[PDB]
Amino acid sequence: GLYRKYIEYPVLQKILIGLILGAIVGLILGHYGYAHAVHTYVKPFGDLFVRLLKMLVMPIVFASLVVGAASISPARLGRVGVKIVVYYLLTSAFAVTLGIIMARLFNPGAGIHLAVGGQQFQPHQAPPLVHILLDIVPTNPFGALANGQVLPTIFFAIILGIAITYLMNSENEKVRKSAETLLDAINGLAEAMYKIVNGVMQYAPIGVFALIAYVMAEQGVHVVGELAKVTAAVYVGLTLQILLVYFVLLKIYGIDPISFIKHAKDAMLTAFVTRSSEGTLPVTMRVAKEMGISEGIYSFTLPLGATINMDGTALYQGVCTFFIANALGSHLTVGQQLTIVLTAVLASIGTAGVPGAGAIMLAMVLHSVGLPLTDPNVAAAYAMILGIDAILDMGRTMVNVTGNLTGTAIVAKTE
Amino acid sequence: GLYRKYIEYPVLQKILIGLILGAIVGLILGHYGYAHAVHTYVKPFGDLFVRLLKMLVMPIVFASLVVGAASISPARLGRVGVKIVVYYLLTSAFAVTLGIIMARLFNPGAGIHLAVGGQQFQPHQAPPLVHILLDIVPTNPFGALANGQVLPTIFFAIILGIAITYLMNSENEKVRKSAETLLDAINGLAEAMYKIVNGVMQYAPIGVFALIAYVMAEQGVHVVGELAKVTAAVYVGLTLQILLVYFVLLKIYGIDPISFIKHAKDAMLTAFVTRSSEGTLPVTMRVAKEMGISEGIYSFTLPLGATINMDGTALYQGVCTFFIANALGSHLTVGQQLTIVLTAVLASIGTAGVPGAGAIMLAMVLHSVGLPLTDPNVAAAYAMILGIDAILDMGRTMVNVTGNLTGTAIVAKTE
Amino acid sequence: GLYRKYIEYPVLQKILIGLILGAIVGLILGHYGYAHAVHTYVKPFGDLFVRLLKMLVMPIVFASLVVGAASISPARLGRVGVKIVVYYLLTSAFAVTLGIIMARLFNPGAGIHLAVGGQQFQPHQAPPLVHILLDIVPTNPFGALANGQVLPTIFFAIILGIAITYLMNSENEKVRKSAETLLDAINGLAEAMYKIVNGVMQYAPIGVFALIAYVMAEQGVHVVGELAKVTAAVYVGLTLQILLVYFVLLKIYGIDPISFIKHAKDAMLTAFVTRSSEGTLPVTMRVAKEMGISEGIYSFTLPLGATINMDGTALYQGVCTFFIANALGSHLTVGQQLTIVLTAVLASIGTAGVPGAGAIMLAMVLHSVGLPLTDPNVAAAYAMILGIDAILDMGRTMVNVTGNLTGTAIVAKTE
Ligand SMILES: N[C@@H](CC(=O)O)C(=O)O
Ligand SMILES: N[C@@H](CC(=O)O)C(=O)O
Ligand SMILES: N[C@@H](CC(=O)O)C(=O)O
Ligand code: NA
Ligand code: NA
Ligand code: NA
Ligand code: NA
Ligand code: NA
Ligand code: NA
């Protein structure tokens, strides 16, 4: 039947067909002013795909991390954490530098007609760092699970797994049996979640088509002029990030880039369409599992990187800061560029793994170089950037997920 | 001792004694203007009974559905879903038609003195259907469990059970063992919940007495005149719904109606007193379990029907729409009656399984026939209806639960 | 290394060093007006310790209580509950009487210069008792777990454990196996939580230092004059409560007070610094486990007492009521003193196990003797008391936890 024929077709080809055709359809409909129709009837399928992916985030993350922490010694986990944090920081700094270079090679926003009088934006307020750090520890793990909050779930899961391992080495028979039973149940939950991810990827092509079509119909028509040059700068910078950092590092550490891409294509495409690292996390974790990476490594690195490691976001923040600076006519000094590097790395760390968060966090980077959002001209340039936010978000989320996978693979190789 | 004597007495007789005596006491106290006293000291016992029943809804539903979906093939589950949805729609349409017939045989609200100047009601706003459908898929299953949300729990539980079955057929020993352990733990939780339901049914008589007494003391004195004819129409229609639909269908499909009633009496009485299908769900599921129905069928059908299958609600909506129409003096044409049938079926589907929801959803049916709640006269008639809402809600919730059980039994017989 | 040397050092000595040095440092810094600096950089470590302790409350309570109720017959549980409630009420009444005696021996607030014009306080409103009692039964156990709510969790856990035991005695093999698996998994979770408590107690010294330093720097400088006499009355009364009630009862029932103190020192110190019985509950439960007390007793008594049994709170409420009365110049009659005893016992029962709750609940006791917070003078005295609230809260929380442990030990001995 038709359903059997659809299911039997390879998932990669279906996803690619959906992506290309959704792009074409969305562009055509947007030019012809049917973006409202696309939002009304096409978007819900993509929303369903996104919801299905998000449904699996907390269970898979919690269960897989508990099992992995149970299967890995604490010292090794600490070494892995140190290595992955170093990799995260270095890659984010390199991404911001590459974005600045791309902005300087081109000149997005130079000699741009700026129109004042649009919507205003409230100045970015620095949240207290101490509160952010303390929030890593949950006051109620059940509440953290019920309210999302991936990072506190990670903390509690690691602690629980270490405790379970310590119990499984005890002298009491009953304690050992109870710990074994709990661990087996949690592992069963994790495997069930991975199977469900397999199932959802079959519906993935329809959601991919819908999401890309909506994004095109809503924003692609706005990719013209200075905004087109911004988009080109960002996307060339993302491509260079991939080729110069991830490919080179995989070559250095002995990982075949071609096999890596073959394994990671599904996660990359899901990140591209959903624009959510957190939402794409189940697919990324399945990719790591298929790569043969130990659970104790990826179950910890990928959920953490989905929040704190965003190379594409950092590159985009740098490029957009330079664009807004040129639009205002101001020139950024070398010290200001280094301030941009530091602040964009920090903002990328603080950016949530959800659509549109990087554009919001760009305000902190802009403020760091004396470009407050309260200024009417800065507000106008920021509004211009926000118009094509989803277009850039697709690529930058894709690069974020790709970098997370590259780091996980490298760290696994080193262990 | 007294406690032992109370516990040893049959539960059915205790519940019936409580029901009759609470009805008498509440009526007498209401006539004598002691409804405040009943609300203050008698109602809390019924509130406790309701809370105890609601405590078991989410765990029993989730665990039983996971186990049942694990024990049933997906194809069979789909066939069962199709059959049960067909039965739901047909029975709801028949219920609305029967309500219209009862309204036309009598004439509730004909020549009624209508007084304007009471409370006004905001016009019913149609919620977006796409959002309602999307909400079936939870973005966080833990959040869905923690916030009620039976339908998303059903979705996630079915998916999890199917995945667990697929794991239990794998070639890996460890995966099979982990899936077995998880399934066994969930099944233990479900059986514990059923035992707790058994325990709560022992306290049920006191709560039944309290609830019926409060309802009588608060609203029975208002059942006079045109409202008495409305109540008679609704209750005769509900009785006819039972006898003409459920009894006849059980006879057709070979199920003995007498044995069915003997098994289902506890759920029917609990629904009558609590006026909550969702709250009565644990008792209904226990009834189905005692009937010998397979878990894979009832664990799916009953939680779904508790939301989307409400024959009594549909019949009540039709009768009340006709009552409000006569009160306004307007005459409903045949096409308007068919509009009423369709819209009342839709409203019954959308009505929540909680007390008083059907009266709220009646606004959509009224609007469908050009009787907006903004009109002062429509508002007056609606307020008159709301005065005896609980009296009608008892019977209509009872019929809703009875129809859910009848459909589950028929579908089980056909499989 | 330094970390190994720190970890190897005995936990008791580390905690004591931290306590003493934090007290000294906080006092010195507060005199020198650096309380802001202590709040900014020192307090976060104590906040981290408190958060880590609170992270374990719900899982440990739920799992341990389920296991204990499964391991104990319902009749024995009822007998234990009756005994512990009797002990709670008697000890709280004695504590209030002792506080009144201490207030009368000294004269806190006598001849005190009262300044009007400060912040006003809204009159205490008596919450409905029926709603409070009904809230003991949760409408959703998952929601109760996710939102804290220790008491509903206790109720559901006891019910679940009893049901599990009844299942483990069934004739069905599958039901018995499923119940066994569920119980084993829950027990594994409980043991893991206890191990995590062991781990957190290693960091406890730093948090103790930080918390005591902040409390001193913020409020100790205010302990002068009439407030110093209030503090002396409260602390002498707490010491007398310990020695006259807990020590004497332990001697009577054959429990060695010295061994009891050696086992309970960690919980006592944690309660002293955190000022939260609920937050200290994991440490208290670990203390009871190390004492050899059966899980079926302590897993029920300690979580319940952490809410409803607060001797230190009752004593503090009595002392502060007398202080406010003298400050106003009013004289309390014997009947008013007995009203104080009853109302302070009730307020201590209703006081939450969190910092500063007893001061809030003191309003009910004050109102019971015609000292409404709306009066400007009563408001001034209340504000004066609130200035040193944390100083008194430390000791009163310590005494609350000590009394809970004493009652658990006595009840265990009697069984
Ligand atoms: N949407 C991106 C973050 C961003 O907005 O830049 C992500 O989820 O990774
Ligand atoms: N209370 C009914 C719905 C209604 O209000 O009609 C039920 O729970 O089934
Ligand atoms: N903080 C105390 C209660 C109080 O405020 O008196 C406790 O947790 O026990
Ligand atoms: Na990075
Ligand atoms: Na981030
Ligand atoms: Na129906
Ligand atoms: Na409904
Ligand atoms: Na007490
Ligand atoms: Na209390």
Numbering used by the authors:
A (entry chain C), B (entry chain A), C (entry chain B): 2 to 416
Q: Which sentences did the original study use to describe this structure?
A:
Membrane glutamate transporters pump substrates against their concentration gradients, serving critical biological functions across all kingdoms of life. Transporters utilize energy from downhill ionic electrochemical gradients to carry concentrative substrate uptake. Transport domains translocate ligands across membranes by moving ∼15 Å from the outward-facing state (OFS) to the inward-facing state (IFS), in an elevator motion.
We generated a mutant, P-GltPh, that eliminates Na+ binding to Na1 (D405N) and introduces a protonatable residue at the tip of HP1 (S279E), mimicking amino acid sequence features of proton-coupled orthologues. Serendipitously, we found that P-GltPh mutant has two slowly exchanging outward-facing conformational substates, OFS1 and 2, binding aspartate with different affinities and enthalpies. smFRET and cryo-EM showed that P-GltPh is predominantly outward facing. To visualize OFS1, we imaged P-GltPh in equilibrium conditions, purified in the presence of 250 mM NaNO3 and 1 mM L-Asp. We refined the maps to 2.2 Å after imposing C3 symmetry. The D405N mutation abolishes Na+ binding at Na1 (Boudker et al., 2007; Riederer et al., 2021 Preprint); in its place, we observed an excess density, suggesting that a water molecule replaces the ion. The S279E side chain points into the extracellular milieu, away from the transport domain. Interestingly, we observed several water densities within the transport domain of the equilibrated structure contributing to the hydrogen bond network between substrate- and ion-coordinating residues. All six resolved buried water molecules are below the substrate-binding site. We speculate that the extensive hydrogen bond network in the cytoplasmic half of the transport domain ensures its rigidity. In contrast, the extracellular half, less constrained by polar interactions, can sample multiple conformations with altered packing.
